[model samples]
Target: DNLYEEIQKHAKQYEIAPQNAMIDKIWKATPGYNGRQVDMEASYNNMKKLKKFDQKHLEFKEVSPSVHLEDLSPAPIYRGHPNKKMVGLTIDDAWGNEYLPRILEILKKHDVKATFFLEGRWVKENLRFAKMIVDANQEVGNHSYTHPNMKTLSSDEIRDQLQKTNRMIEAATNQKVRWFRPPSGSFRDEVVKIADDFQMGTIMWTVDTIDWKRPEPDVLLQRVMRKIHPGAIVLMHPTSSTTEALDTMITKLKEQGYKVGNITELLDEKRV
Candidate 1:
């Protein structure tokens, strides 16, 4: 009866709805935030003693959102939610294994895990290298069979691209591939749906090293360093320059207080 008007007014003013995690048209993989609500009973009891409105006395409880990133039907994930201080590195190997060993060694030295997207044809020709990636305990994902522009292909072709690569990778590694990256970063909604049909998430990158140009190691480092951020997914390739820059890049990321890992760890949406 007393101060109810003031308390209710404050509650109404402060009420916020929890945001649902979704795929943004431009930003992509936007994370959700927990909302807050005033606990009327608890708040009233605490304010009863004061007999007047006091903002400090109000109590609140966290309201979790019903929809999450995973709950979405199917979406391409470009980066993780910005709520966490972490980044993911992806190595897309469509051709060449010249620097594979050294890159693996660099990652091992730092005790870090990264996702390697290997094309099926590449795996077929380089089974030993594929096995080496598995032995190093890094994550693997599909990079298509022929590295085709998925948007140019029919549905059947797209399925063949993902399914064939999946079988080859699974046969080689004995592990399920949970992610897919379209070749040349080219894809349409159909590509994402097909990937979803295979139970794999379509992965994208927030930062690109452009190491394919074979930039000098120092230049590679500076390019990646400038764009690093929380929940960023860095794209790379198995090239001489990338191998040279891997060690120092990891060290600098650690210095910035960012935890680096594979896509699974970076995109994990569970709230602790």
Candidate 2:
């Protein structure tokens, strides 16, 4: 089903092109001659036999593909293109205390970055810690002034919730905020709409670790490794179990050839 896709990728990488006529000729001449799919081995054999391209003279480089979508109010980005080798690691700082510094040390040791969503009051209390996140070149997102079910808030209350936390993050880090993750995961379209009016997009998660319950390290380990994938946005809170399992998570994800990074890195975009 996706043989042509791999073929295109092959051509794109090797910097060569083939016409449909030649492709069809190769298809007919292929040894198996199934006419159902292109056996890459047969295609390669034919490539050498036929005068396909002067591989001796070609221009090619390692160009990674980018998938960045525009034109949406408060653009909702949950995952990147499946073909890209990236994963969004998002951590919500509930209480903004012990867990952050511990996780920060681990991230620094592993050289991985992540997005951190902070509460407004917590920002005031943990100014240095909040700055630590930005100093590490990690992204900071607004998680509201207080953790509450946003659907219960009225219009002005919603604005206050979004703006206050965003301003706190900006003042602490001296960087503009572009993302908002609804507190408690109780979000509505209205929350996103209000966020857009204030110049921020709402980010959703593809994977939820459910680490807030403080499950055993083994439980956290199994759930994460089992469901993790390329272009996946993982959801988590700064909990003790997560702190304990993070190193293993990084080592294993890297062993699997996935580069774990912050939200923008996870998106893997090169937008001008």
lDDT of 1 at 93: 86
**Candidate 1 per-residue C-alpha lDDT over 152-205 given as tens digits, one digit per residue, 9 for 90 to 100:** 999999999999999999998899999999999999999999999999989989
Q: Which TM-score value belongs to model 2?
A: 0.75
**Leading candidate by lDDT:** 1
lDDT of each: 0.88, 0.71
State which candidate has the highest TM-score: 1
Location of the lowest summed lDDT over 10 successive residues in candidate 2: 26-35
Model 1 residue runs over 4 Å out of place are 1-20, 31-65, 270-272
lDDT of 1 at 99: 86
lDDT by residue for model 2 over 40-151, one digit each (tens)? 4555444554436433322233322221233333445566545456777899875737777788888999899999988887898889888888888788988989888897
